[PDB]
Design a binder for this molecule. Structure first.
Ligand SMILES: CCCCCCCCCCCCCCCCCC(=O)OC[C@H](COP(=O)(O)OCCN)OC(=O)CCCCCCCCCCCCCCCCC
Ligand code: SF4
Ligand code: SF4
Ligand code: SF4
Lengths: 385, 176, 49, 69, 152, 138, 309, 93
């Protein structure tokens, strides 16, 4: 049998993920991919840093999420430190935490529609995506990778503006999602390109430990978005999509309705924000203000020491996970009792979502296999967990 | 809650099949839809002519390093080493010494612009507000041997401009 | 018959600024051909339109 | 939308040449006359005959009524 | 000679007028180059076409972070390029490997393997200084082919 | 790898492979291997006391034969030039053809390589590497 | 001066498609909200003349794993027959008055599949050995879908020659009796010439800067040829004897619009995933082709409208 | 007499250009699969019986027509019945 390794080929998509194919003439029936192109030494590296200093290495763990990562870290630290965050701060973590889902669910369709080979829905949506990075630069520090969420809540307040901008932005977005509905849904060939492909629906679709979509849209109703709270996140109203059967085209149609939920939540979140503060007030965790660290005596000693070493975290293990826009996000943060943490093991999606490519692939073509991968939305560097 | 999408049984009668038969046979689909949504070509191309035109920014945008000083030159740096201890890449290296006047200053001052991961915490750690991430992306030399910035780049680089820097701090220091 | 109603707008827009030398000199760098209305002052000869 | 119009007027003009060229050759080679076509062997027999009696050796010239009076 | 040296103002102009780059998407510096492909700062048709097969390349671009499991695969593709080539690496993790720099399994530099000509700094260089690096590269081509065999 | 003398052979895909010049008299000289050349310099660069005492480079074992030209076609199984091509980088039908066929195994009283040790390389092991022709497997 | 008619057709048709890769992108440009070539042209029109210089500067390294007599043999025939097929084509006067030429176009286009079988096979392994086979295997299926419905309009036009085809369409625009055939003409011709919906199309990746340009220059030569071939057949133009110039004015300008269609369909659609791609021919196309083949026989009989010849 | 002097320029132009392409401006100084066989045999069967179908437009300017009518339709029948038994087994094609 021919043993071609169609992978390292820089054939668009993402020139990585080099695997083997022991194809039985035309059908595959055996797929054993290799990973480890970026191992980077991540989990060993954090063992020498402090809590505030290690924080951007959670940010660079995806390619896409900037505020959904570091959402799974501060909320994994504030439980250890007996802190609730202040109420103005929680309305921003839901706002940017429900704006990164309008970055994955744009990239999760276009990049899938580029491996397939369509050109024009790649350029028709990233030109609208530019209207959104101006937000990131205006609020935090940079284009994408922002050390913005801290353990002491939000870093700083978003400036004057950004409320007649987001309302200006979000009132003209549903026309753009009505474009791709005409581009892909009512079309037949793309429907014929993906129906009854990847029919994985049994209880081994959950014994493989999958997280969301490539879940509930295939069947079993469950999510971490209204059975487990984060912040002020249950006080808004929305629904969660479910597809019919257990193929890719009934996990594709989650993502059209999923983007039709984030517009509602943003248009529901803006009406409910109170004026208030930014940081936690007790200042053993938050740094004091700049106009304060130049006047009093108490401000500097709880400033100058708070950057030489970090916080004082109590011992005892902990664990949590939140909704990453492609899955769960496990962090088993072992604390020791000093400024420097102990072991920090992460669970990212793709461990389950790509080990189950063995079950999902066989009985099918070779041209099916590239169409499988862009449905799970697998990003490397994120499989470094 | 719920929603059952793509869950709809067909019509299956005499007349509505003629809407599904004219679709496949004469292609009232795929042209009314996909030949019109492409054209849609008459819109204006939103392209920036980069060597002439430039895009928007923010007043808190990061970039090139620089050092400031007081009115008539004083070296605002006090070498309190705090930017070093929070640099995640340890791109800072400072050796200090008592200068003969008596007040302490610096001797070596380094920013590994290769290693520099731009966490910008140096801008938010100096008490006397010395180092500033200056907003100019002018870069791209030709050797690895050049981007290691010594001190006499940085005071010079902090003095190619100041009115660019001094207006952005003065429009943003109330927030932080 | 719209090949002349917007052409009258474009005729002064092309011809009525600099003539033939001021058009062809600025032509040979890019398609940046529409002349700016308001001008800046600074500094050398780089009038920021 | 404007810049594509000089793109059309290059390759499309590049097809205007051979239709112009060939119709200015066979018209020129027969002196403002079209070329006598021959698809059937009875049709060729006229040209095989009339070239021998045209004036010397040509198929694109005629005699007329005034030849034999 | 004025006759012969006039010729390389076409040929050394023609190679800096049509560059067909390869991109190695490995890490977060890949994503920002896609926004350069997105038509705001439209990368196409300013001299340079989009993606292309690995055979027909002139300017290879390493972006992101190199691991020791990719150090053989980089050199093999680097051999298959034709002769007038150039290497330009964006991203601060291609100039010393950013941080991750003290890790046990990251290639220190992306310079101890391939010879690279233009160094753009930064976690993501913002697709704003990177067109500036490319216009630096066409500015670097002021070289000559005549008055090389005409001298020696 | 990329010298001129050994690559003068097997770049002779031609309508006749003639040796120099259809005779097995003087062939060959002493082909020292290139690792021994770069190793001799680095030992001498702080030797010490190696000034004036000029040195000679021993070749392989021992003189060499005519078999070398037959050894080429047996196992091979029969940089700033210009923009298109250099007009004259020829095979040079001049005194090039005789500068190699003039062997001159010279005086062995020079010390000159084994004392600047250690350099010992055969020919039969390094010959697979430099030669590269159409079979490439068998 | 028959020779100067030759050079004023071969040379002025190379610039007809060498200045089309420009037009390929700009039409692609102004769909995506982006402009054409901006810095070199100024209107783009100085771009491909420089890029044509590069592929003959850049070094064509040869495979040591292949023969040489076979490897350059496929670009020999690539400009050979794909330019020879231009010859008996009227505008309004063809270079050669062939007594039968519609068979002659199919006779030359059937050797187009005989070139791709060379370059993949004589070169290398796997990709170039198995991957280059299937592309013949799809393009052998599109002569039977091509030639049959071709024959169904010769029953009504009258004969084999192309000079009578202009006179018989002087009032018609013959798409109107054959608008079912118009789809299966244009779909099948799109599929043979290896374009974006009907693509699976190692037979290019081994070619360096030298002979890749040929099998990029010959492939483009095909695509305006299937435009100009559909042009004289379906959308026939008016003819004036006293004014031959007015023919060619409204001749190429109609073929130039259909030339845009290959650029226009490319900006909409995905691929077809090879197992479907032949399955949509035999199961789906071919039974309708036989039915309409029976249709154009009985109806000129049951009209007493047999075309004269 | 130029047919034959018509293509001789075309083929000498292609073999010229490769010498400036592959030559002198360079100077560097199978497993069997059954399902990918039966379609070639199936094609050649329908390739023959379109050449017998080929002489139709000359077969209309003829004598008594119902001979030429009912017989020319019969070849399409044999071309179609050949489908149906083969339609019972096409394979993964
Ligand atoms: C009684 C009176 C005498 C008889 C008169 C009756 C007149 C009937 C006229 C019929 C002739 C045209 C129909 C020819 C067949 C068309 C091909 C076809 O329909 O295939 C359908 C194709 C296959 O998939 P399908 O079978 O539909 O299964 C999925 C079901 N959901 O599924 C599809 O729908 C996909 C469509 C094919 C994919 C290719 C599309 C590419 C776009 C091509 C654009 C063509 C533009 C127009 C042509 C250019 C003009 C020259
Ligand atoms: S910025 Fe602060 S820590 Fe850094 S050198 Fe200046 S005074 Fe010292
Ligand atoms: S700019 Fe970034 S990497 Fe450099 S010292 Fe400041 S925080 Fe550290
Ligand atoms: S640190 Fe720089 S190179 Fe590394 S992943 Fe982030 S943006 Fe990319």
């Amino acid at each position: 049998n021919l043993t071609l390794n169609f992978g390292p080929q820089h054939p668009a998509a993402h020139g990585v993920l080099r695997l083997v194919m022991e194809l039985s003439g035309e059908m595959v029936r055996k797929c054993d991919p290799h990973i480890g192109l970026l191992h980077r030494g991540t989990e060993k590296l954090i063992e020498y840093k402090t809590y505030l200093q290690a924080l951007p290495y959670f940010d660079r763990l995806d390619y896409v999420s900037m505020m959904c990562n570091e959402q799974a870290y501060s909320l994994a630290v504030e439980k250890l430190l007996n802190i609730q965050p202040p109420p103005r701060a929680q309305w921003i973590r839901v706002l940017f935490g429900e704006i990164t889902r309008l970055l994955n669910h744009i990239m999760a369709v276009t990049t899938h529609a580029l491996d397939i080979g369509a050109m024009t829905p790649f350029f028709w949506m990233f030109e609208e995506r530019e209207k959104m990075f101006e937000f990131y630069e205006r609020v935090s520090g940079a284009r994408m990778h922002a050390a913005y969420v801290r353990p002491g809540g939000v870093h700083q307040d978003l400036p004057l503006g950004l409320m007649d901008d987001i309302y200006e932005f979000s009132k003209n977005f549903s026309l753009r999602i009505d474009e791709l509905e005409e581009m892909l849904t009512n079309n037949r060939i793309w429907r014929n390109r993906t129906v009854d492909i990847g029919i994985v629906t049994a209880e081994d679709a959950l014994n493989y430990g999958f997280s969301g979509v490539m879940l509930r849209g295939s069947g079993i109703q469950w999510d971490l978005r209204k059975t487990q709270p984060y912040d002020v996140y249950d006080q808004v109203e929305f629904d969660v999509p479910i597809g019919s059967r257990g193929d890719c085209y009934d996990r594709y149609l989650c993502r059209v309705e999923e983007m039709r939920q984030s517009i509602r939540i943003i248009s529901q979140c803006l009406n409910k924000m109170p004026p208030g503060e930014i940081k936690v007030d007790d200042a053993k965790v938050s740094p004091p203000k700049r106009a304060e660290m130049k006047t009093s005596m108490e401000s500097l000693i709880h400033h100058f020491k708070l950057y030489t070493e970090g916080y004082q975290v109590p011992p005892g293990a902990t664990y949590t996970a939140i909704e990453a826009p492609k899955g769960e996000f496990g962090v088993y943060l072992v604390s020791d009792g000093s400024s420097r943490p102990y072991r920090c093991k992460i669970k990212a999606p793709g461990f389950a979502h790509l080990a189950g490519l063995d079950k999902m692939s066989k009985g099918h073509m070779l041209a099916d296999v590239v169409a499988i991968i862009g449905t799970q939305d697998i990003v490397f560097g994120e499989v470094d967990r | 809650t719920y929603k059952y999408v793509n869950l709809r049984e067909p019509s299956m009668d005499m007349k509505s099949v003629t809407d599904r038969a004219a679709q496949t046979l004469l292609w009232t689909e795929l042209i009314r839809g996909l030949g019109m949504t492409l054209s849609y070509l008459f819109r204006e191309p939103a392209t920036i002519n980069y060597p002439f035109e430039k895009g928007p920014l923010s007043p808190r945008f990061r970039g090139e390093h620089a050092l400031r000083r007081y009115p008539s030159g004083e070296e605002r740096c006090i070498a309190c080493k705090l930017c070093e201890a929070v640099c995640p890449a340890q791109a800072i290296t400072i050796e200090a010494e008592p200068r003969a006047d008596g007040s302490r200053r610096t001797t070596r001052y380094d920013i590994d612009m290769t290693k520099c991961i731009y966490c910008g915490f140096c801008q938010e750690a100096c008490p006397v507000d010395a180092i500033v991430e200056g907003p100019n992306f002018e870069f791209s030399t030709e050797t690895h041997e050049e981007l290691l910035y010594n001190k006499e780049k940085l005071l010079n680089n902090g003095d190619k401009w100041e009115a660019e820097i001094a207006a952005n701090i003065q429009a943003d220091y109330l927030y932080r | 018959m719209e090949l002349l109603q917007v052409l009258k707008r474009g005729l002064q827009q092309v011809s009525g600024h600099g003539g033939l030398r001021g058009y062809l000199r600025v032509l040979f760098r890019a398609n940046d051909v529409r002349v700016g209305t308001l001008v800046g002052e600074d500094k050398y000869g780089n009038k920021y339109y | 939308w404007f810049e594509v119009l000089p793109g059309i007027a290059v390759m499309g003009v590049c097809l205007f040449i051979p239709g112009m060229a060939t119709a200015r050759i066979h018209r020129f080679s027969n002196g403002g006359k079209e070329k006598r076509v021959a698809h059937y062997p009875y049709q060729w027999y006229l040209m095989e005959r009339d070239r021998r009696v045209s004036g010397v050796n040509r198929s694109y010239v005629s005699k007329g009524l005034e030849n034999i009076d | 000679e004025y006759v012969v040296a006039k010729l390389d103002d076409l040929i050394n102009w023609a190679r800096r007028s049509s560059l067909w780059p390869m991109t190695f998407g490995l890490a977060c510096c890949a994503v920002e180059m896609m926004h350069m492909a997105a038509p705001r700062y439209d990368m196409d048709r300013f001299g340079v076409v989009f993606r292309a097969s690995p055979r027909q390349s002139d300017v290879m671009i390493v972006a992101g972070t190199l691991t020791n499991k990719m150090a053989p695969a980089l050199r093999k593709v680097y051999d298959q390029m034709p002769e007038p080539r150039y290497v330009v690496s964006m991203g601060s993790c291609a100039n010393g490997g950013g941080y991750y720099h003290y890790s046990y399994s990251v290639v220190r530099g992306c310079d101890r393997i391939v010879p690279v000509d233009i160094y753009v700094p930064g976690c993501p260089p913002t697709a704003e200084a990177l067109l500036y690096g490319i216009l630096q590269l066409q500015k670097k081509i002021k070289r000559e082919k005549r008055l090389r065999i005409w001298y020696r | 790898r990329e010298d001129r003398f050994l690559n003068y052979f097997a770049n002779i895909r031609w309508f006749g492979g003639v040796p120099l010049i259809s005779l097995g008299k003087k062939t060959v000289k002493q082909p020292v291997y290139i690792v021994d050349v770069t190793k001799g310099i680095i030992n001498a660069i702080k030797d010490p006391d190696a000034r004036g005492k000029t040195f000679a480079f021993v070749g392989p074992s021992r003189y060499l034969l005519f078999d070398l030209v037959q050894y080429v076609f047996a196992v091979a199984h029969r940089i700033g030039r210009l923009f298109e091509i250099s007009p004259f980088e020829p095979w040079t039908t001049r005194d090039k053809v005789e500068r190699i066929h003039t062997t001159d195994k010279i005086l062995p009283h020079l010390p000159g390589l084994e004392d600047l040790g250690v350099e010992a390389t055969p020919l039969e092991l390094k010959a697979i590497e430099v030669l590269r022709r159409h079979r490439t497997y068998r | 001066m028959f020779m100067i008619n030759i050079l004023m057709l071969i040379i002025p048709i190379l610039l007809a498609v060498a200045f089309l890769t420009l037009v390929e992108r700009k039409v692609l440009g102004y769909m995506q909200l982006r402009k054409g070539p901006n810095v070199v042209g100024p209107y783009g029109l100085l771009q491909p003349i420089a890029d044509a210089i590069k592929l003959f500067i850049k070094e064509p390294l040869r495979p040591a794993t292949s023969s040489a007599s076979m490897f350059i043999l496929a670009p020999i025939m690539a400009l050979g027959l794909a330019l020879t097929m231009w010859i008996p084509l009227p505008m309004p006067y063809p270079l050669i008055n062939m007594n039968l030429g519609v068979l002659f176009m199919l006779a030359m286009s059937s050797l187009a599949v005989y070139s791709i079988l060379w370059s993949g096979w004589a070169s290398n392994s796997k990709y170039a050995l198995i991957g280059a086979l299937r592309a013949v295997a799809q393009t052998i299926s599109y002569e039977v879908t091509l030639a049959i419905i071709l024959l169904s309009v010769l029953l009504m036009s009258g004969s084999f020659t192309l000079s009578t085809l202009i006179t018989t369409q002087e009032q018609m625009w013959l798409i109107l009796p054959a608008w079912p055939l118009a789809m299966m003409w244009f779909i099948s011709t799109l599929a043979e010439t290896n374009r974006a919906p009907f693509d699976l199309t190692g037979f290019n990746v081994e070619y360096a800067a030298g002979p890749f340009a040929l099998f990029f220059m010959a492939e483009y030569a095909n695509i305006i040829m299937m435009n100009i071939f559909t042009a004289i057949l379906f959308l026939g133009t008016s003819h004036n004897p006293h004014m031959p110039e007015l023919y060619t004015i409204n001749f190429t300008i109609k073929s130039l619009l259909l030339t845009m269609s290959f650029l226009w369909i490319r900006a909409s659609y995905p691929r077809f995933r090879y197992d479907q791609l032949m399955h949509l021919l035999w199961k789906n196309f071919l039974p309708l082709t036989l039915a309409l083949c029976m249709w154009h026989v009985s109806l000129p009989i049951l009209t007493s409208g047999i075309p004269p010849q | 007499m130029n047919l034959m002097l018509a293509l001789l320029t075309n083929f000498t132009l292609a073999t010229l250009l490769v010498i400036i392409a592959f030559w002198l401006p360079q100077l560097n100084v199978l497993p069997f699969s059954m399902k990918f066989f039966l379609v070639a045999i199936t094609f050649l069967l329908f390739d023959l019986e379109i050449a017998l179908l080929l002489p139709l437009p000359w077969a209309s300017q003829t004598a008594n027509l119902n001979t030429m009518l009912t017989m020319a339709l019969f070849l399409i029948i044999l071309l179609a019945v050949s489908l149906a038994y083969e339609w019972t087994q096409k394979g993964l094609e």
